[PDB]
Symmetry: none
Subunit: 134 residues, 4 copies
Protein backbone atom coordinates (compact mmCIF):
# COMPACT_ATOMS: atom_id res chain seq x y z
CA UNK A 1 0.00 0.00 0.00
CA UNK A 2 1.02 3.57 -0.75
CA UNK A 3 -0.91 6.50 0.69
CA UNK A 4 -1.34 9.49 -1.59
CA UNK A 5 -3.88 12.21 -2.23
CA UNK A 6 -6.90 12.59 0.05
CA UNK A 7 -6.17 9.45 2.13
CA UNK A 8 -2.63 10.69 2.73
CA UNK A 9 -3.87 14.11 3.85
CA UNK A 10 -6.32 12.40 6.21
CA UNK A 11 -3.57 10.19 7.69
CA UNK A 12 -1.29 13.15 8.29
CA UNK A 13 -4.15 15.00 10.00
CA UNK A 14 -4.64 12.06 12.37
CA UNK A 15 -0.91 11.99 13.16
CA UNK A 16 -0.87 15.74 13.85
CA UNK A 17 -3.86 15.44 16.17
CA UNK A 18 -2.34 12.43 17.93
CA UNK A 19 0.85 14.35 18.73
CA UNK A 20 -1.22 17.15 20.28
CA UNK A 21 -3.34 14.76 22.35
CA UNK A 22 -0.46 12.58 23.57
CA UNK A 23 2.40 15.01 23.97
CA UNK A 24 4.60 12.68 21.89
CA UNK A 25 7.53 13.90 19.79
CA UNK A 26 7.14 11.91 16.58
CA UNK A 27 4.30 9.94 15.00
CA UNK A 28 4.49 7.56 12.06
CA UNK A 29 2.33 5.20 10.12
CA UNK A 30 4.36 2.44 8.56
CA UNK A 31 3.62 -0.82 6.79
CA UNK A 32 4.82 -4.08 8.33
CA UNK A 33 7.85 -4.08 6.03
CA UNK A 34 9.06 -0.75 7.40
CA UNK A 35 7.96 1.59 4.61
CA UNK A 36 6.93 4.98 6.00
CA UNK A 37 3.43 5.83 4.76
CA UNK A 38 3.10 9.11 6.67
CA UNK A 39 4.92 10.92 9.46
CA UNK A 40 4.63 14.08 11.54
CA UNK A 41 6.85 15.69 14.15
CA UNK A 42 6.05 18.08 16.99
CA UNK A 43 7.30 21.61 16.31
CA UNK A 44 8.72 21.82 19.84
CA UNK A 45 10.72 18.61 19.54
CA UNK A 46 14.28 18.37 18.22
CA UNK A 47 15.07 16.84 14.83
CA UNK A 48 14.11 13.15 15.02
CA UNK A 49 16.52 10.28 14.45
CA UNK A 50 16.39 9.05 10.84
CA UNK A 51 12.75 8.01 10.42
CA UNK A 52 13.33 5.37 7.76
CA UNK A 53 15.86 3.76 10.09
CA UNK A 54 13.36 3.88 12.96
CA UNK A 55 10.64 2.38 10.77
CA UNK A 56 12.85 -0.45 9.53
CA UNK A 57 13.87 -1.39 13.08
CA UNK A 58 10.27 -1.22 14.32
CA UNK A 59 9.19 -3.54 11.50
CA UNK A 60 12.06 -5.87 12.37
CA UNK A 61 10.94 -5.94 15.98
CA UNK A 62 7.32 -6.63 14.98
CA UNK A 63 8.49 -9.77 13.21
CA UNK A 64 10.88 -10.81 15.98
CA UNK A 65 8.43 -10.72 18.88
CA UNK A 66 6.05 -13.15 17.19
CA UNK A 67 7.93 -16.14 18.65
CA UNK A 68 7.16 -14.87 22.17
CA UNK A 69 3.56 -14.13 21.21
CA UNK A 70 3.02 -17.59 19.75
CA UNK A 71 4.57 -19.25 22.80
CA UNK A 72 1.83 -17.48 24.77
CA UNK A 73 -0.90 -18.59 22.34
CA UNK A 74 -1.14 -15.32 20.39
CA UNK A 75 -0.49 -14.86 16.67
CA UNK A 76 1.41 -11.67 17.44
CA UNK A 77 1.41 -8.77 19.90
CA UNK A 78 -0.92 -5.99 18.81
CA UNK A 79 0.51 -3.37 21.16
CA UNK A 80 4.04 -2.86 22.49
CA UNK A 81 5.65 -0.27 24.74
CA UNK A 82 9.41 0.09 25.19
CA UNK A 83 10.68 2.51 27.82
CA UNK A 84 14.21 3.74 28.35
CA UNK A 85 15.56 6.28 30.82
CA UNK A 86 14.45 9.29 28.78
CA UNK A 87 12.75 8.00 25.64
CA UNK A 88 9.81 5.70 25.04
CA UNK A 89 8.35 3.93 22.04
CA UNK A 90 4.70 2.94 21.51
CA UNK A 91 3.69 0.69 18.62
CA UNK A 92 0.16 -0.47 17.87
CA UNK A 93 -1.42 -2.25 14.93
CA UNK A 94 -3.24 0.07 12.53
CA UNK A 95 -5.16 -2.65 10.78
CA UNK A 96 -3.69 -5.95 9.65
CA UNK A 97 -1.07 -4.32 7.43
CA UNK A 98 0.21 -1.18 9.14
CA UNK A 99 1.62 0.08 12.43
CA UNK A 100 1.25 3.33 14.33
CA UNK A 101 4.50 4.41 15.96
CA UNK A 102 4.80 7.10 18.64
CA UNK A 103 8.15 8.22 20.05
CA UNK A 104 7.86 10.15 23.29
CA UNK A 105 9.80 11.59 26.19
CA UNK A 106 8.91 12.30 29.82
CA UNK A 107 6.50 15.10 28.87
CA UNK A 108 4.06 12.65 27.26
CA UNK A 109 1.94 10.90 29.91
CA UNK A 110 2.01 7.19 29.08
CA UNK A 111 -1.70 6.91 29.79
CA UNK A 112 -2.43 9.55 27.15
CA UNK A 113 0.00 7.98 24.69
CA UNK A 114 -1.88 4.68 24.95
CA UNK A 115 -5.40 6.14 25.06
CA UNK A 116 -5.07 8.41 22.04
CA UNK A 117 -2.58 6.13 20.33
CA UNK A 118 -5.10 3.29 20.35
CA UNK A 119 -7.81 5.55 18.95
CA UNK A 120 -5.47 6.92 16.29
CA UNK A 121 -4.45 3.41 15.21
CA UNK A 122 -8.11 2.54 14.61
CA UNK A 123 -8.66 5.73 12.62
CA UNK A 124 -5.56 5.03 10.55
CA UNK A 125 -6.65 1.42 9.99
CA UNK A 126 -9.86 2.70 8.39
CA UNK A 127 -7.97 5.16 6.19
CA UNK A 128 -5.57 2.42 5.09
CA UNK A 129 -8.44 0.02 4.35
CA UNK A 130 -10.30 2.46 2.12
CA UNK A 131 -7.11 3.59 0.36
CA UNK A 132 -6.43 -0.06 -0.47
CA UNK A 133 -9.97 -0.86 -1.60
CA UNK A 134 -11.04 1.73 -4.18
CA UNK B 1 28.63 -21.13 29.79
CA UNK B 2 27.29 -20.08 33.18
CA UNK B 3 24.59 -17.60 34.31
CA UNK B 4 25.44 -14.07 35.36
CA UNK B 5 24.03 -15.19 38.67
CA UNK B 6 22.75 -18.26 40.50
CA UNK B 7 20.39 -18.29 43.46
CA UNK B 8 20.67 -20.53 46.49
CA UNK B 9 20.15 -20.27 50.25
CA UNK B 10 18.87 -16.94 51.59
CA UNK B 11 19.19 -14.88 48.38
CA UNK B 12 17.11 -17.42 46.47
CA UNK B 13 14.46 -17.45 49.19
CA UNK B 14 14.26 -13.66 49.26
CA UNK B 15 13.86 -13.64 45.47
CA UNK B 16 11.18 -16.32 45.53
CA UNK B 17 9.26 -14.39 48.19
CA UNK B 18 9.27 -11.32 45.93
CA UNK B 19 7.99 -13.41 43.01
CA UNK B 20 5.22 -14.99 45.09
CA UNK B 21 4.10 -11.65 46.51
CA UNK B 22 4.16 -10.07 43.05
CA UNK B 23 1.86 -12.78 41.67
CA UNK B 24 -0.62 -12.13 44.48
CA UNK B 25 -0.52 -8.34 44.06
CA UNK B 26 -0.77 -8.33 40.27
CA UNK B 27 -2.97 -11.27 39.40
CA UNK B 28 -0.31 -12.44 36.93
CA UNK B 29 0.09 -16.10 35.97
CA UNK B 30 3.85 -16.57 36.05
CA UNK B 31 6.79 -14.66 37.47
CA UNK B 32 10.46 -15.28 36.72
CA UNK B 33 13.84 -13.82 37.30
CA UNK B 34 16.21 -14.64 34.49
CA UNK B 35 19.71 -13.55 33.61
CA UNK B 36 20.41 -11.64 30.43
CA UNK B 37 21.74 -14.90 28.94
CA UNK B 38 18.38 -16.65 29.24
CA UNK B 39 18.94 -18.84 32.29
CA UNK B 40 16.05 -19.03 34.76
CA UNK B 41 17.35 -18.01 38.19
CA UNK B 42 14.05 -18.40 40.05
CA UNK B 43 10.41 -18.82 39.04
CA UNK B 44 6.99 -19.06 40.67
CA UNK B 45 3.53 -19.72 39.28
CA UNK B 46 0.12 -18.68 40.55
CA UNK B 47 -1.69 -21.55 42.25
CA UNK B 48 -4.74 -20.96 40.06
CA UNK B 49 -2.86 -20.82 36.77
CA UNK B 50 -2.57 -23.71 34.30
CA UNK B 51 0.74 -25.33 33.43
CA UNK B 52 2.93 -22.58 31.94
CA UNK B 53 4.49 -22.77 28.50
CA UNK B 54 8.08 -24.10 28.61
CA UNK B 55 9.75 -21.62 30.97
CA UNK B 56 13.24 -22.23 29.64
CA UNK B 57 12.01 -21.41 26.13
CA UNK B 58 10.17 -18.34 27.45
CA UNK B 59 13.33 -17.13 29.20
CA UNK B 60 15.43 -17.78 26.09
CA UNK B 61 13.05 -15.77 23.92
CA UNK B 62 12.93 -12.91 26.43
CA UNK B 63 16.74 -12.90 26.50
CA UNK B 64 16.89 -12.96 22.71
CA UNK B 65 14.49 -10.02 22.60
CA UNK B 66 16.49 -8.04 25.16
CA UNK B 67 19.51 -8.30 22.89
CA UNK B 68 17.59 -7.52 19.70
CA UNK B 69 15.85 -4.33 20.85
CA UNK B 70 19.15 -2.61 21.61
CA UNK B 71 19.46 -1.30 18.04
CA UNK B 72 16.17 0.57 18.46
CA UNK B 73 17.27 1.72 21.91
CA UNK B 74 20.56 3.10 20.59
CA UNK B 75 18.76 4.92 17.79
CA UNK B 76 16.67 6.67 20.44
CA UNK B 77 19.78 7.57 22.44
CA UNK B 78 19.32 4.83 25.05
CA UNK B 79 21.76 2.07 26.00
CA UNK B 80 18.79 -0.29 26.13
CA UNK B 81 15.13 -0.35 27.12
CA UNK B 82 14.63 -0.92 30.83
CA UNK B 83 10.91 -1.72 30.79
CA UNK B 84 8.89 -3.42 28.06
CA UNK B 85 5.24 -4.44 27.74
CA UNK B 86 3.91 -6.70 24.96
CA UNK B 87 0.15 -7.08 24.73
CA UNK B 88 -1.83 -9.62 22.74
CA UNK B 89 -5.60 -10.10 22.64
CA UNK B 90 -5.62 -12.01 25.92
CA UNK B 91 -2.02 -12.62 27.00
CA UNK B 92 0.54 -10.01 27.99
CA UNK B 93 4.21 -9.88 28.90
CA UNK B 94 5.95 -7.44 31.25
CA UNK B 95 9.74 -7.33 31.40
CA UNK B 96 11.81 -4.99 33.56
CA UNK B 97 15.49 -4.80 34.39
CA UNK B 98 16.42 -6.23 37.78
CA UNK B 99 19.86 -4.73 38.07
CA UNK B 100 22.46 -4.80 35.32
CA UNK B 101 22.48 -8.56 34.76
CA UNK B 102 18.95 -9.84 35.31
CA UNK B 103 15.37 -9.38 34.14
CA UNK B 104 12.01 -9.71 35.88
CA UNK B 105 9.39 -11.38 33.67
CA UNK B 106 5.64 -11.44 34.34
CA UNK B 107 3.21 -13.32 32.11
CA UNK B 108 -0.40 -12.26 32.59
CA UNK B 109 -3.88 -12.54 31.13
CA UNK B 110 -7.01 -10.38 31.31
CA UNK B 111 -7.42 -11.07 35.02
CA UNK B 112 -4.29 -9.08 35.85
CA UNK B 113 -5.02 -5.32 35.82
CA UNK B 114 -2.23 -3.71 33.78
CA UNK B 115 -1.87 -0.89 36.28
CA UNK B 116 -1.24 -3.43 39.04
CA UNK B 117 1.21 -5.35 36.86
CA UNK B 118 3.32 -2.25 36.24
CA UNK B 119 3.07 -0.89 39.78
CA UNK B 120 4.01 -4.08 41.60
CA UNK B 121 6.20 -5.25 38.74
CA UNK B 122 8.37 -2.15 39.16
CA UNK B 123 8.57 -2.69 42.91
CA UNK B 124 9.55 -6.30 42.31
CA UNK B 125 12.29 -5.47 39.82
CA UNK B 126 13.88 -3.04 42.26
CA UNK B 127 13.69 -5.53 45.12
CA UNK B 128 15.23 -8.22 42.93
CA UNK B 129 17.94 -5.83 41.75
CA UNK B 130 19.07 -5.45 45.37
CA UNK B 131 18.92 -9.20 46.01
CA UNK B 132 20.84 -10.04 42.83
CA UNK B 133 23.73 -7.77 43.78
CA UNK B 134 24.14 -8.90 47.39
CA UNK B 135 23.85 -12.49 46.16
CA UNK C 1 29.95 9.81 15.86
CA UNK C 2 30.40 11.18 12.33
CA UNK C 3 33.47 11.21 10.09
CA UNK C 4 34.66 14.50 8.60
CA UNK C 5 37.64 15.92 6.73
CA UNK C 6 40.78 13.80 6.49
CA UNK C 7 39.48 10.99 8.75
CA UNK C 8 36.55 10.54 6.35
CA UNK C 9 38.89 10.59 3.34
CA UNK C 10 41.13 7.93 4.86
CA UNK C 11 38.07 5.79 5.61
CA UNK C 12 36.76 6.06 2.05
CA UNK C 13 40.22 5.24 0.69
CA UNK C 14 40.35 2.04 2.73
CA UNK C 15 36.91 1.03 1.46
CA UNK C 16 37.95 1.69 -2.15
CA UNK C 17 41.06 -0.46 -1.87
CA UNK C 18 39.16 -3.20 -0.07
CA UNK C 19 36.66 -3.43 -2.93
CA UNK C 20 39.55 -3.71 -5.36
CA UNK C 21 41.37 -6.47 -3.45
CA UNK C 22 38.28 -8.50 -2.59
CA UNK C 23 36.14 -8.15 -5.69
CA UNK C 24 33.19 -7.18 -3.48
CA UNK C 25 30.39 -4.89 -4.74
CA UNK C 26 29.72 -2.52 -1.85
CA UNK C 27 31.71 -1.57 1.23
CA UNK C 28 30.39 0.38 4.22
CA UNK C 29 31.48 1.47 7.63
CA UNK C 30 28.50 1.82 9.90
CA UNK C 31 27.71 2.27 13.58
CA UNK C 32 25.48 0.14 15.81
CA UNK C 33 22.38 2.24 15.24
CA UNK C 34 22.52 1.89 11.46
CA UNK C 35 24.23 5.15 10.54
CA UNK C 36 26.53 5.05 7.51
CA UNK C 37 29.90 6.58 8.42
CA UNK C 38 31.36 5.99 4.96
CA UNK C 39 30.59 3.94 1.87
CA UNK C 40 31.96 3.05 -1.55
CA UNK C 41 30.64 1.01 -4.46
CA UNK C 42 32.52 -0.83 -7.20
CA UNK C 43 32.22 0.92 -10.57
CA UNK C 44 31.23 -2.33 -12.29
CA UNK C 45 28.51 -3.15 -9.77
CA UNK C 46 24.81 -2.32 -10.29
CA UNK C 47 23.18 0.39 -8.18
CA UNK C 48 23.16 -0.89 -4.59
CA UNK C 49 20.02 -1.52 -2.56
CA UNK C 50 19.15 1.39 -0.23
CA UNK C 51 22.39 1.69 1.74
CA UNK C 52 20.80 3.24 4.82
CA UNK C 53 18.33 0.36 4.99
CA UNK C 54 21.16 -2.13 4.51
CA UNK C 55 23.13 -0.52 7.35
CA UNK C 56 20.02 -0.47 9.53
CA UNK C 57 19.42 -4.19 9.00
CA UNK C 58 23.07 -5.01 9.67
CA UNK C 59 22.93 -2.98 12.90
CA UNK C 60 19.74 -4.76 13.93
CA UNK C 61 21.46 -8.08 13.31
CA UNK C 62 24.55 -7.02 15.28
CA UNK C 63 22.34 -6.42 18.30
CA UNK C 64 20.30 -9.60 17.92
CA UNK C 65 23.12 -12.12 17.50
CA UNK C 66 24.64 -11.21 20.87
CA UNK C 67 22.27 -13.63 22.63
CA UNK C 68 23.71 -16.51 20.59
CA UNK C 69 27.25 -15.23 21.15
CA UNK C 70 26.86 -15.22 24.92
CA UNK C 71 25.46 -18.75 24.94
CA UNK C 72 28.72 -19.74 23.23
CA UNK C 73 30.88 -17.89 25.76
CA UNK C 74 31.45 -14.80 23.60
CA UNK C 75 30.38 -11.22 24.33
CA UNK C 76 29.52 -11.00 20.65
CA UNK C 77 30.58 -12.26 17.23
CA UNK C 78 33.49 -10.37 15.72
CA UNK C 79 33.03 -11.74 12.21
CA UNK C 80 29.93 -12.97 10.38
CA UNK C 81 29.28 -14.28 6.88
CA UNK C 82 25.80 -14.74 5.42
CA UNK C 83 25.59 -16.57 2.11
CA UNK C 84 22.66 -16.77 -0.28
CA UNK C 85 22.44 -18.42 -3.70
CA UNK C 86 24.20 -15.53 -5.42
CA UNK C 87 24.67 -12.73 -2.89
CA UNK C 88 26.74 -12.73 0.27
CA UNK C 89 27.37 -10.44 3.23
CA UNK C 90 30.52 -10.09 5.34
CA UNK C 91 30.46 -8.10 8.59
CA UNK C 92 33.45 -7.53 10.85
CA UNK C 93 33.75 -5.41 13.97
CA UNK C 94 35.81 -2.26 13.46
CA UNK C 95 36.48 -1.47 17.09
CA UNK C 96 33.72 -1.42 19.69
CA UNK C 97 31.57 1.19 17.95
CA UNK C 98 31.70 0.45 14.22
CA UNK C 99 31.17 -2.34 11.70
CA UNK C 100 32.75 -2.99 8.32
CA UNK C 101 30.26 -4.34 5.81
CA UNK C 102 31.11 -5.97 2.49
CA UNK C 103 28.38 -7.07 0.08
CA UNK C 104 29.56 -9.50 -2.57
CA UNK C 105 28.41 -11.86 -5.30
CA UNK C 106 29.86 -15.04 -6.80
CA UNK C 107 32.65 -13.08 -8.49
CA UNK C 108 34.30 -12.22 -5.16
CA UNK C 109 36.61 -14.91 -3.73
CA UNK C 110 35.40 -15.43 -0.15
CA UNK C 111 38.94 -16.12 1.01
CA UNK C 112 40.03 -12.66 -0.11
CA UNK C 113 36.88 -11.02 1.24
CA UNK C 114 37.66 -12.37 4.71
CA UNK C 115 41.43 -11.88 4.52
CA UNK C 116 41.38 -8.25 3.39
CA UNK C 117 38.08 -7.50 5.10
CA UNK C 118 39.59 -8.32 8.49
CA UNK C 119 42.61 -6.10 7.83
CA UNK C 120 40.45 -3.27 6.50
CA UNK C 121 38.32 -3.41 9.64
CA UNK C 122 41.43 -2.99 11.78
CA UNK C 123 42.49 0.06 9.76
CA UNK C 124 39.02 1.59 9.98
CA UNK C 125 38.91 0.90 13.72
CA UNK C 126 42.00 3.09 14.12
CA UNK C 127 40.62 5.87 11.91
CA UNK C 128 37.44 5.86 13.99
CA UNK C 129 39.08 5.89 17.43
CA UNK C 130 41.37 8.65 16.15
CA UNK C 131 38.37 10.53 14.78
CA UNK C 132 36.80 10.76 18.24
CA UNK C 133 40.13 11.59 19.86
CA UNK D 1 8.34 -33.26 12.17
CA UNK D 2 9.69 -35.69 14.75
CA UNK D 3 12.50 -38.13 14.00
CA UNK D 4 12.16 -41.70 15.24
CA UNK D 5 12.99 -45.25 14.22
CA UNK D 6 15.42 -45.74 11.34
CA UNK D 7 15.33 -42.12 10.10
CA UNK D 8 16.43 -40.94 13.54
CA UNK D 9 19.27 -43.46 13.68
CA UNK D 10 20.43 -42.42 10.22
CA UNK D 11 20.34 -38.75 11.24
CA UNK D 12 22.40 -39.44 14.36
CA UNK D 13 24.94 -41.36 12.28
CA UNK D 14 25.33 -38.38 9.94
CA UNK D 15 25.88 -36.06 12.91
CA UNK D 16 28.44 -38.39 14.50
CA UNK D 17 30.30 -38.83 11.21
CA UNK D 18 30.26 -35.07 10.67
CA UNK D 19 31.89 -34.52 14.07
CA UNK D 20 34.61 -37.05 13.22
CA UNK D 21 35.29 -35.43 9.84
CA UNK D 22 35.28 -31.83 11.07
CA UNK D 23 36.61 -31.85 14.61
CA UNK D 24 33.61 -29.74 15.61
CA UNK D 25 32.35 -29.82 19.19
CA UNK D 26 28.58 -30.15 18.78
CA UNK D 27 26.26 -31.04 15.91
CA UNK D 28 22.49 -30.57 15.79
CA UNK D 29 19.60 -30.96 13.37
CA UNK D 30 16.78 -28.59 14.34
CA UNK D 31 13.54 -27.51 12.70
CA UNK D 32 12.94 -23.88 11.75
CA UNK D 33 10.81 -23.58 14.88
CA UNK D 34 13.80 -24.34 17.10
CA UNK D 35 12.96 -27.92 18.05
CA UNK D 36 15.95 -30.25 18.29
CA UNK D 37 15.37 -33.24 16.02
CA UNK D 38 18.72 -34.90 16.74
CA UNK D 39 22.00 -33.98 18.41
CA UNK D 40 25.46 -35.38 19.09
CA UNK D 41 28.47 -34.06 20.98
CA UNK D 42 32.18 -34.81 20.63
CA UNK D 43 33.40 -37.01 23.49
CA UNK D 44 36.52 -34.85 23.84
CA UNK D 45 34.56 -31.59 24.06
CA UNK D 46 33.33 -30.05 27.32
CA UNK D 47 29.66 -29.93 28.29
CA UNK D 48 27.71 -27.96 25.66
CA UNK D 49 25.43 -25.03 26.47
CA UNK D 50 21.75 -25.94 26.84
CA UNK D 51 21.02 -27.32 23.37
CA UNK D 52 17.32 -26.47 23.40
CA UNK D 53 18.25 -22.87 24.20
CA UNK D 54 20.82 -22.86 21.40
CA UNK D 55 18.27 -24.24 18.93
CA UNK D 56 15.65 -21.65 19.87
CA UNK D 57 18.13 -18.82 19.31
CA UNK D 58 19.41 -20.29 16.05
CA UNK D 59 15.83 -20.54 14.77
CA UNK D 60 15.18 -16.96 15.87
CA UNK D 61 18.26 -15.83 13.95
CA UNK D 62 17.15 -17.75 10.85
CA UNK D 63 13.90 -15.79 10.87
CA UNK D 64 15.57 -12.46 11.63
CA UNK D 65 18.13 -12.45 8.81
CA UNK D 66 15.51 -12.86 6.09
CA UNK D 67 14.97 -9.10 5.82
CA UNK D 68 18.68 -8.67 4.99
CA UNK D 69 18.53 -11.59 2.57
CA UNK D 70 15.53 -10.12 0.76
CA UNK D 71 17.16 -6.69 0.50
CA UNK D 72 19.99 -8.43 -1.34
CA UNK D 73 17.56 -10.26 -3.64
CA UNK D 74 17.63 -13.59 -1.77
CA UNK D 75 14.63 -15.34 -0.20
CA UNK D 76 16.91 -16.12 2.74
CA UNK D 77 20.51 -17.02 3.56
CA UNK D 78 21.14 -20.73 3.15
CA UNK D 79 24.49 -20.71 4.96
CA UNK D 80 25.76 -18.58 7.84
CA UNK D 81 28.98 -18.49 9.85
CA UNK D 82 29.38 -16.54 13.09
CA UNK D 83 32.85 -16.36 14.63
CA UNK D 84 33.89 -15.00 18.00
CA UNK D 85 37.32 -14.88 19.63
CA UNK D 86 37.46 -18.67 19.94
CA UNK D 87 34.04 -20.23 19.32
CA UNK D 88 32.37 -20.47 15.92
CA UNK D 89 28.86 -21.28 14.74
CA UNK D 90 27.97 -22.81 11.37
CA UNK D 91 24.34 -23.04 10.23
CA UNK D 92 23.18 -24.46 6.92
CA UNK D 93 19.75 -25.29 5.53
CA UNK D 94 18.93 -28.99 5.66
CA UNK D 95 16.05 -28.96 3.22
CA UNK D 96 13.23 -26.43 3.37
CA UNK D 97 12.19 -27.25 6.94
CA UNK D 98 15.36 -27.96 8.93
CA UNK D 99 18.75 -26.54 9.87
CA UNK D 100 22.12 -28.19 10.47
CA UNK D 101 24.08 -26.55 13.27
CA UNK D 102 27.78 -27.06 14.04
CA UNK D 103 29.57 -25.41 16.95
CA UNK D 104 33.34 -25.42 16.64
CA UNK D 105 36.53 -23.82 17.92
CA UNK D 106 39.93 -22.78 16.55
CA UNK D 107 41.01 -26.42 16.28
CA UNK D 108 38.49 -27.19 13.54
CA UNK D 109 39.58 -25.85 10.12
CA UNK D 110 36.64 -23.88 8.73
CA UNK D 111 37.13 -25.29 5.25
CA UNK D 112 36.37 -28.81 6.46
CA UNK D 113 33.50 -27.58 8.63
CA UNK D 114 31.84 -26.05 5.56
CA UNK D 115 32.60 -28.98 3.25
CA UNK D 116 31.27 -31.68 5.54
CA UNK D 117 28.61 -29.39 6.94
CA UNK D 118 27.19 -28.93 3.45
CA UNK D 119 27.43 -32.68 2.80
CA UNK D 120 25.59 -33.40 6.05
CA UNK D 121 22.86 -30.84 5.42
CA UNK D 122 22.03 -32.47 2.08
CA UNK D 123 22.00 -35.93 3.65
CA UNK D 124 19.83 -34.80 6.54
CA UNK D 125 17.46 -33.06 4.14
CA UNK D 126 16.80 -36.38 2.40
CA UNK D 127 16.33 -38.18 5.71
CA UNK D 128 13.89 -35.55 6.98
CA UNK D 129 11.97 -35.82 3.72
CA UNK D 130 11.62 -39.58 4.00
CA UNK D 131 10.67 -39.39 7.67
CA UNK D 132 7.87 -36.92 6.86
CA UNK D 133 6.83 -39.01 3.86
MG1 LIG E 1 46.82 -5.35 2.64
Amino acid sequence: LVLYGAPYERAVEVLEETLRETGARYALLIDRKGFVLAHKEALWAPKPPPLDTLATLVAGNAAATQALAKLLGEARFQEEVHQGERMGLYVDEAGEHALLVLVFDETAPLGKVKLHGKRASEALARIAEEALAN
